[model samples]
Target: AVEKMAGDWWVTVNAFIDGKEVEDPFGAGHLQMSTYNTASNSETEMWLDDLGNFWEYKLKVNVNYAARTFSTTGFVDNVTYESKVKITDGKVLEKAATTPSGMPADSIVYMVQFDDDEDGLTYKVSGFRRTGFPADDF
Candidate 1:
């Protein structure tokens, strides 16, 4: 059910390096990327295209739709890393002006785990569907 986890999203990452949270880790805007089959040769694959902000570019991943999760290993900026994603509220939400779906509007939940810097860097990402409001489209 790739459709369940397919859509644009507004996301935030609670970043931690060496077990310490970064006070403000918004190096890139909250316009997160979660693409389905974005150039993968396999059906159980997806990509994360966050432009190196979360540490990579067009990273490939293997997904398990039944578990609403995806994970993979790849290199970023000369360093090898591992990443995983867990989706919540995997419902096709109706577009609306709301942070979370069913809260008078539409949305979904995306949780990400990014591990880089063999030194220990972690990211806790949370996101909601990007409602195409005010002329924006997803």
Candidate 2:
């Protein structure tokens, strides 16, 4: 469910220029995406990074429960940015974290397309949703 997407997410973005992979312009960034509900039938995502900490001022992303995907597109700062994200692995804490370096968690395939210049810019951003920070610890 899209509601499950509500959380503070830290993601790493990889870029693709004209269908080819390029070094990620932006490294790990912060994302605060809200949950989607039927009442408002609305959802918005906020992004913060070296890219100027821009956010979705008044954008409602498209949600598809059947396909497990959502996307949004709009003009911001005189640039039209488009984004589409698909849930590669749904939320599953069925298996707790072991001593393993990283535990299995909810993951998503966040693919975005937009125009950065005369050429097109695409990003294959990936990350897992985090639940909590150690109890009372930050």
Candidate 3:
């Protein structure tokens, strides 16, 4: 069974296409974290897309504990330039390519898939656990 994520950690993505590995064009060191509480139904993200190549873009994620899953949408705010991912068995799986919201045909779209493991993508973390509480109290 998989467990939930908490605290701050540096996260990375190992992307694949049709089962063949490809470079994480955005690089491997994508810093990520989950709040101390999982019930928040929050969204986490980071900016990765290059400016001018697309609209102001960001990597977005929605965590769902009840569903035991998470969803990822990347390159937001640009039509035909977004993708989605699925979380399962402690890993994020890439889904089929699709156009973004408010984009017309002939727009460029990107697809991203992630590699999952026995422990999920919480595969890496920082030297010390990060929490929302005061440090001295801990």
Candidate 4:
């Protein structure tokens, strides 16, 4: 039998400054890249199949002034984390966490929501890091 994919889902990451959660820069005019209509560039949204494939992976954060990039891929109804990156647009901003050239030690975690199928299922699959901080300078 073939596996099934899930409903539309989003890949989201929470940002922070000085141990405080910061609003999404993309949602607040921080990034100038095209979001492709995923509600907000703040979150990387996509669809996942049971075979661990992705449909709308927002690999690029498209955020300027910051030095970070991340990606994810997996099936629906289950939480999956794929990848992360530290990117630079053109500015010369330095990282604070260990001051590792271009990484900030301060960042927050957020929630994620997903629907497994296109069918009429009121319930959704959601996930989040209960107490995990993003490793800096990655």
TM-score of each prediction:
0.57, 0.52, 0.29, 0.19
1-138: candidate 4 lDDT, tens digit per residue: 000111122223334435565554234321111122233423333222222332122332232222332223322223234432222221111221222234243221212223432331221112211112333112
True-structure RMSD for candidate 1: 6.0
- Better model by TM-score: candidate 2 vs candidate 3: 2
The top-ranked prediction according to lDDT is 1
lDDT of each: 0.51, 0.42, 0.31, 0.26
Q: Count clashing residue pairs in model 2.
A: 0
For residue 132, give model 4's deviation from the true position in Å. 32
Candidate 2 residues lying further than 4 Å off, grouped into runs, are 26-58, 73-101, 115-119, 134-138
**Which lDDT value does model 4 have at 40?**
40
The lDDT of model 4 is 0.26
Candidate 3: tens digits of C-alpha lDDT, residues 3-113: 333334323344454555444434544333332332443434222222222122334434444543433543124222443233223222222212223222111122333
**What is the per-residue lDDT of model 2 for residues 1-138, given as tens digits with 9 covering 90 to 100?**
345554343345677766677655654344433233445544433222223233222233455554555555543332224542222222312223221245555655455544343344555655555555443112
Error of 2 at 16 (Å): 0.9
**Clash tally, candidates in order:** 1, 0, 3, 8
Candidate 1 structure, TM-score to reference:
0.57
Question: Model 4, stretches more than 4 Å misplaced?
Answer: 1-5, 10-13, 28-138
